Structure 1
């Protein structure tokens, strides 16, 4: 905080004197509205203006107000990546809890499994202290009381929540199992202590080991969560905490290059980014020149060439030069901060498969308890009436002991808690591993829907275009006075600028012959005429290079005589499609328009066909151009002269046939069709505006990562289904054998000390199976 109701007690502050030492200079200096007065009420809540007269002024008032016992040094209460501190504390908590659990658990298992086999140590443990109860059970009970009563508290606290609401979950079972085992051991110890005739056996190893491994599983879950969050965080930061403040008004009078935090340099404050000073913030950069590997103003190495002054500011590390920034709004409201929030909300949200897990668990836990109860009565009543051989009973217990022993065994051999510790971690790890590639999922629902896909809707614009206008795309075949017509020659096409008219202005920039400027007249807008398809023509020159469309040609004089249809078929075949022109108010001369494609399209289409899904693309141009593009690509059904509305009806038609179809592209105007489509997956990431109407959002611009997204989704669904197959296979065999349908015919059953081990063994393997997703790699390592 420390923005509106600012409150700080920094180094040296121990009493109200230092609090007032901050106060007196902080609040008194302008930028406050003085919301009431608490008259030295410690955290006095008054208004403040952290926008203009904010961080820099407030913080430096804190320092200059101070006379040092420690000299207050700007210890603003702000999140140190509060996620980092938070999962640090959480990992610390669970790690410590598990580590103190093992401290008791490991002893007990030893003392009653391994140690008795060796002497005289077991002989010490056999020393009677009363009747037949011995030292062994005494110390075992003492050591295993903490494990449940103190450390295992969640197992009870969480269970009560579910039970009071009328439902249940994993906890419920685990708690019942361990509790029943513990009290059965207490019961068996009492019999030993009261009467020396009895010599029964105990069970505490189960109650220790099971709890220990379950806690280990929860620890692994939260470690996976921490890894995913940090993988997000490293990508979301991409900025140094401090920027160099060369203070000057707008341009000129450069005072000095300081170095302070990137919230203290807004509102006409200036960064003079030197080489290597990574671009932290936004806000118009009126001066400077730096080609750095990004899209803001350029000029050092990688040629994009924006002259000083342009409205985009963010970027990566530098090169040989500098810029002089004029921040209006720092890079803090940037999308990344709330991609963090949005993906957390998606993580907070869940998928149908997650909803599937709860429903099965809803009508499973009741069954296990009932079956465990039933198998008790079976052995008991048959035992009481003695309807089966006595010799099956092992020595040192009776039928009643066998009945309860089987009762416990079923209750501790159930679900290895896959349904609750495998799905909710696989879903999570998938998102993090995707985020490592820039691509981000929008929760599990996105995973499911993307996994169900067999069709993709592409589009040429901004998805498969580069653009290079020249004689192969934009100029004459006849003679042209004032060639090559850009600087002061061709104003005949600078009338009505749009995404294509500007290209008509820029091929002239590209082709300017060799002289600098022949400089004749540029009569822009003289006879200004606009018509759809080509709305630029006035009067100027370029052999009168006016340009026009189906209504400007025959208007001026242009008869569209046979040679233009010849140069039309010719150009369209070579994809260099012509655009109608009015050279010298005549049919002489013939413009063109063409487009290079991103050089991985063939790879992508071929490999998508390899997975076996349909590729579809639409265009707004004529049918022939789209057909030529199809010939180049090798795509299926093709559409042309299509608006985003038409894209919407085509999407609806594909879906109603029973086809889940995706679409590519981020041109925000796709929003109707983008929402209409089954999923999102917008290429060339913009901001959360894409997220508004899309679910999948791809970060980079390469078409390659589209393959990666669907591949990862397919892999995740396969892994989850395989884990469910395991959780059915183990569970369908564990229940009978433990309950006993093999003992009556072979005489083998699982004692609870070992029966619980299988439950423990599966739980680790299932989670460990899920965690292996992190070793995913690209299906196309640069094709």
Structure 2
């Protein structure tokens, strides 16, 4: 019992791997018990220290074929009625009981924390003790959109009148120019009030965002707008104040137009950007729902002593408890099957729908679907140690590992901010130099000389005005709309094309994909078995035999049986099945039936269906020719079942999974573009190799656990490659979250759909190629939009700086407004034009692969099993 040792085991890929390890280790003398997990690769061994040593245990595990290395409980409860400090009694009683290390209770919140050894004490014991005492105990982004929307609305409310007044003044006005005081004017006063409101309210979020950006040692669009608007607002106030002091006859021109203009559009762009980025992460909630909510704890044993059956919450269960699973109910916790035989569906881990036989001494997975009978399970892993919980942890880690991507607008603004400052400073110094040296150019191009102020003031004031005009014109207005507008339009195109894209990230990353991994079941081939071929081993028509088999197999519940029946129905008129029929079945051995309704088949004695073992035990042998056919069929990893009548061999039926017709074309198309194709699946190597040969995938991975899939994705990403994961099962969810781009089949599991960032509503593999092409068109359009959001402003900078002054061109007041409309309209029109995109026709893909596509020999395909390639 004492000196329990901890071991780490690698190279295990099956639950049968765990069962063999446990059985062999327990068989050896000295070893008392062993526990181990599949994905965690962690094991605990209890043995007598005086008989065997940890080094021997590691050597024994290594001999089994799995690498072994030697390496080194808290409960929170809420208790009612904790209104008195004396009820100290609870803590003292807990300390008295063995196996409890510490226990404390807080009177302020009635919360209690207990630390103990799980192997000796559990939460149930503490709860029972508390109940006995006399008290009950029980175990314990949109903000950005809202604030951006508020800022945009406030700017629009206090910014629209600013634009309306400007249009009225420019288009047409002497009344508005009337001066209440010599330095100010009614029009100027209105501009100042509205601008102040916009800056105080609309610019509040801009200031903090820029303030936060500065703490990040980086500059982005928010910093650019804040600096530009603040400078323009400050200068306007100063010129107004000096004009009032100097009581000038004519009020100076103010730059109150800019801050309302930039805040409105930038806030709108940021609001649109965050709306597109909005997404849901309900995948974690779906995974939690899979776990069972209750278990049927048993008392004593199951041989000759049984007293009570108690419904206990899964969280309250502890290791070593015995639970009962009814058929159709989920397994509550991982454990060992004792005195129970039934069918278990383990699509959570391996992903296939084929049930796996469970026999006493075997192991089960939490969340697996039980059927065919009742089962008694001895829990071994509970709580977060369950396999399902480990998957949830992997999904959480993958989601948290997705760092944010810097927007192209922010990157452009990073270089823009120094650029505008440099030209603004350069424009200031040169104009000051020009005025000081000559002072004649200023008079010719500026009537300000008529004022009585000194010459130095005129040259300084004009230089400051010219530099600031350059700065205001330089700052773009449609920069924020460049990316979000195209992204939203691109998403609409995807929706019209049967592709659902969650957020704008996938559209900006699919074009970077260089490696794609496809799951086998459901993704590359249909998830339900289908009859592949039928052969004849007196010589009745094949159709009559098929009808006879269908009637006998009508009541069968095996997926193969129903697949055979539907295939027979399709081959026949399937008007109605025969009435008279007797059914008898030996599970895992075969099925026998009595059919005497052959007349019904003719209008439209004994039937035996089974395998090699059934024939051998029934006195029927296997011929050489038929045996060779079975070996060839089995070589392709497909099931085969033989039919006999009245003890005489009749024929054989082969059932195999049919690959999607477009899977081969999609794989070839991806390869033609220089994108690697990888087939990763949890099925046996034989089936994976056959599927890969059919579709032409060079790299095949088989017997892969969910943890292994994440590792493979991480390994591919480590090589600077972008990985696009395609899957439909629960086991694929952690890979989809970890992958750069996640694609979920439309008919797949709910968890897979939520985890994946892209959903194929039309469940056609060609959409993966189409999505990459659609992303390429979007990114190219986004860059063009940025040009439209900068070229108009860039062309205006020389005019503001006065480069074209000698040519007769001057910065007219309406140019600033004109630049906005041209840039905003151009960006919107450019983004909207993406709606004309059309999905490439399947004929084009076929024509492009008329001769390039060619089947691949099975000998050239390399099959790798496991992560370390320990096995062949």
TM-score, structure 1 length as denominator? Answer: 0.57
Aligned partner of 1:493 in structure 2 is: none
CA distance, structure 1, for counterparts of residue 104 and residue 506 of structure 2: 45
Report the CA distance shift for 1:338/1:12 in structure 2 as closer, same or farther (over 3 A): same
Aligned partner of 1:603 in structure 2 is: 662
Report the CA distance shift for 1:411/1:578 in structure 2 as closer, same or farther (over 3 A): closer
Give 1:379 shift. 6.2
Tell me, yes or no, if the aligned pair for 1:35 and 1:46 is still in contact at 8 Å. yes
User: Equivalent residues in 2 for 1:362-441 (5 A)?
Assistant: 363-376=415-428, 385-387=439-441, 390=444, 399-400=462-463, 402-413=465-476, 416-417=479-480
Give 1:727 shift. 0.7
Tell me, yes or no, if the aligned pair for 1:126 and 1:136 is still in contact at 8 Å. no
Tell me, yes or no, if the aligned pair for 1:283 and 1:311 is still in contact at 8 Å. yes
Report the CA distance shift for 1:109/1:307 in structure 2 as closer, same or farther (over 3 A): same
Match of 1:344 among 399, 408, 419: 399
Report the CA distance shift for 1:457/1:157 in structure 2 as closer, same or farther (over 3 A): closer
CA distance, structure 1, for counterparts of residue 634 and residue 364 of structure 2: 40
CA distance, structure 2, for counterparts of residue 779 and residue 50 of structure 1: 62
Tell me, yes or no, if the aligned pair for 1:719 and 1:770 is still in contact at 8 Å. no
Q: Which has the higher strand share?
A: 2
Give 1:186 shift. 1.9
CA distance, structure 2, for counterparts of residue 23 and residue 185 of structure 1: 71
**Residue aligned with 1:199, SS:** coil
Aligned partner of 1:95 in structure 2 is: 146
Report the CA distance shift for 1:320/1:571 in structure 2 as closer, same or farther (over 3 A): closer
Report the CA distance shift for 1:602/1:273 in structure 2 as closer, same or farther (over 3 A): same
Instruction: Pick which of 415-424 and 195-204 moved more.
Output: 415-424
Q: Deviations over 1:314-335 (max 9, x none)?
A: 269x999999877653568535
CA distance, structure 1, for counterparts of residue 780 and residue 87 of structure 2: 60
Tell me, yes or no, if the aligned pair for 1:447 and 1:713 is still in contact at 8 Å. yes
User: Equivalent residues in 2 for 1:257-336 (5 A)?
Assistant: 262-265=314-317, 267=319, 268=321, 270=323, 281-284=332-335, 295=347, 311-314=364-367, 328-330=381-383, 333-336=388-391
CA distance, structure 1, for counterparts of residue 826 and residue 286 of structure 2: 33
Q: Deviations over 1:437-460 (max 9, x none)?
A: 89999999974553x46x989989
Residue 207 of structure 1 pairs with residue 259 of structure 2: yes
CA distance, structure 2, for counterparts of residue 771 and residue 236 of structure 1: 37
Tell me, yes or no, if the aligned pair for 2:428 and 2:467 is still in contact at 8 Å. yes
Residue segments in structure 1 that go unaligned for 5+ positions in a row: 77-86, 478-505, 519-535, 548-559, 580-588, 640-646, 652-662
Report the CA distance shift for 1:699/1:110 in structure 2 as closer, same or farther (over 3 A): closer
Tell me, yes or no, if the aligned pair for 2:342 and 2:371 is still in contact at 8 Å. yes
Aligned partner of 1:180 in structure 2 is: 231
Give 1:176 shift. 1.8
Tell me, yes or no, if the aligned pair for 2:344 and 2:371 is still in contact at 8 Å. yes
Aligned partner of 1:230 in structure 2 is: 281
Aligned partner of 2:214 in structure 1 is: 160
Tell me, yes or no, if the aligned pair for 2:341 and 2:373 is still in contact at 8 Å. yes
CA distance, structure 1, for counterparts of residue 174 and residue 80 of structure 2: 59
CA distance, structure 2, for counterparts of residue 577 and residue 239 of structure 1: 31
Report the CA distance shift for 1:410/1:136 in structure 2 as closer, same or farther (over 3 A): closer
CA distance, structure 2, for counterparts of residue 357 and residue 257 of structure 1: 58
Aligned partner of 2:102 in structure 1 is: 34
Tell me, yes or no, if the aligned pair for 1:246 and 1:256 is still in contact at 8 Å. yes
Match of 1:721 among 757, 761, 780: 780
**Residue aligned with 1:146, SS:** helix
Tell me, yes or no, if the aligned pair for 1:244 and 1:271 is still in contact at 8 Å. no
CA distance, structure 2, for counterparts of residue 75 and residue 762 of structure 1: 59
CA distance, structure 2, for counterparts of residue 355 and residue 288 of structure 1: 58
CA distance, structure 1, for counterparts of residue 840 and residue 368 of structure 2: 27
CA distance, structure 2, for counterparts of residue 407 and residue 756 of structure 1: 13
CA distance, structure 2, for counterparts of residue 292 and residue 387 of structure 1: 92
Match of 1:712 among 771, 785, 796: 771
Tell me, yes or no, if the aligned pair for 1:442 and 1:695 is still in contact at 8 Å. no
User: Equivalent residues in 2 for 1:433-452 (5 A)?
Assistant: 447=510, 449-450=512-513, 452=514
Match of 1:128 among 180, 193, 201: 180
Tell me, yes or no, if the aligned pair for 1:289 and 1:308 is still in contact at 8 Å. yes
Tell me, yes or no, if the aligned pair for 1:5 and 1:47 is still in contact at 8 Å. yes
Give 1:348 shift. 1.2
CA distance, structure 1, for counterparts of residue 820 and residue 251 of structure 2: 25
**Residue aligned with 1:200, SS:** coil
Q: Deviations over 1:602-650 (max 9, x none)?
A: 133345567884898999889xx97x997xx6x6xx69xxxxxxx6xxx
TM-score, structure 2 length as denominator? Answer: 0.53
Aligned partner of 2:795 in structure 1 is: 736
Aligned partner of 2:298 in structure 1 is: 248
**Residue aligned with 1:47, SS:** strand
CA distance, structure 2, for counterparts of residue 64 and residue 124 of structure 1: 86
Aligned partner of 1:194 in structure 2 is: 245
